Amino acid sequence: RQIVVGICSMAKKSKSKPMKEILERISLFKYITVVVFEEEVILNEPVENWPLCDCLISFHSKGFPLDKAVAYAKLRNPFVINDLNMQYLIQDRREVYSILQAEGILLPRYAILNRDPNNPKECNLIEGEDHVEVNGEVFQKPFVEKPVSAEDHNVYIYYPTSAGGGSQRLFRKIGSRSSVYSPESNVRKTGSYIYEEFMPTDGTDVKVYTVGPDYAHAEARKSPALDGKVERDSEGKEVRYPVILNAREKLIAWKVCLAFKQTVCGFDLLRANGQSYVCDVNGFSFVKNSMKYYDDCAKILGNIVMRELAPQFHIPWSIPLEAED
Ligand SMILES: O=P(O)(O)O[C@@H]1[C@@H](OP(=O)(O)O)[C@H](OP(=O)(O)OP(=O)(O)O)[C@@H](OP(=O)(O)O)[C@H](OP(=O)(O)OP(=O)(O)O)[C@@H]1OP(=O)(O)O
Ligand SMILES: Nc1ncnc2c1ncn2[C@@H]1O[C@H](COP(=O)(O)OP(=O)(O)O)[C@@H](O)[C@H]1O
Ligand SMILES: [Mg+2]
Ligand SMILES: [Mg+2]
Ligand SMILES: [Mg+2]
Ligand SMILES: [Mg+2]
Ligand SMILES: [Mg+2]
């Protein structure tokens, strides 16, 4: 029989153009059949009625019932491409940073400010004009303030008085804008945050996209805080610039992929001061608008499936050479 690869995610992701481009390519494998789980089934049917698969590609995004996906995996015991339990941790920036540190991955110096919502003023925070002290640790402006929830994209950057003060407020892109300047110089007074040193880059973020530990595509984009005006092409896509990862960065990608147990994994690098710092690990993310990435991503995933499952299906399989980017 065919090896079944099940795709289990919210429709917003499962029906995205990149997903469709990759799935049609995975379907080219002679012995693989792709089955995309309907969102209505994911949300409203018990896991016992979800379709069978032999390999499960499943990932959390807003509204996804991760507890059900875990229960399904436990019930059916499929080969899992992106580990589900790690996806609980990926939702919490504190957990993400803790894993990065445990793996010896360079990241910004940071401190966690946990605030009791019932008692917001008695947290370990002291604030001056050009700095904060978080659990006694000092951050001179510029510094970055991130909500502990990784799914909250309201990241603020606080500028020193010498540069005019105020702050840049980042958010999920709204049409042409990715951030806005605020005259507010004082930090947020409710919520829990990570405070971290600002890493000076050349004005770009490096976005990395792994497909297993030995492949990563990288590309760059204008730092969303620089002025908040998104660079768009004639198709309405964000302008992306060429990047080739150096040897250190290829190792970082290997480590992130394995540490988070996410075969398909996006994360962000800040190239600063002659090193590269991870500032965000998002888990499952596909590149938009690279034909070559669709080809490579589909072939690697299909080959991962065959390698793991061909023997139990009695299908002959010889491990082919794969590119690294
Ligand atoms: O909101 P989510 O998290 O469910 O989905 C978002 C996520 O896509 P994913 O699921 O990972 O593929 C972002 O990638 P990411 O994971 O690297 O995120 P972070 O580094 O944590 O910010 C992506 O930003 P980008 O990397 O393309 O700039 C963003 O596109 P959008 O702002 O629309 O960009 P445009 O199409 O307008 O240019 C998506 O927003 P929506 O689709 O509106 O919800
Ligand atoms: N320590 C830092 N130094 C400089 N820029 C940062 C730092 N942390 C985040 N940023 C900038 O803010 C953006 C959003 O932060 P990120 O941690 O990626 O949050 P999100 O999960 O919302 O994407 C980054 O892409 C980067 O441009
Ligand atoms: Mg097929
Ligand atoms: Mg996500
Ligand atoms: Mg959007
Ligand atoms: Mg990011
Ligand atoms: Mg993120």
UniProtKB/Swiss-Prot annotation:
Location of the protein in the cell: Cytoplasm, Cytosol
This protein's record includes keyword rRNA-binding: no
Binding locations of ATP: 93, 146, 153, 172, 196-199, 205-207, 223, 268, 280-282
One Gene Ontology CC term in the entry: cytosol
UniProt record, GO biological process: inositol metabolic process; inositol phosphate biosynthetic process; inositol phosphate metabolic process; sensory perception of sound
GO MF: 5-diphosphoinositol pentakisphosphate 1-kinase activity; ATP binding; diphosphoinositol pentakisphosphate kinase activity; inositol hexakisphosphate 1-kinase activity; inositol hexakisphosphate 5-kinase activity; inositol hexakisphosphate kinase activity; inositol-1,3,4,5,6-pentakisphosphate kinase activity
Disulfide topology: none
UniProt modified residues of type Phosphoserine: 182
Membership in a protein family: Belongs to the histidine acid phosphatase family. VIP1 subfamily.
Protein name: Inositol hexakisphosphate and diphosphoinositol-pentakisphosphate kinase 2
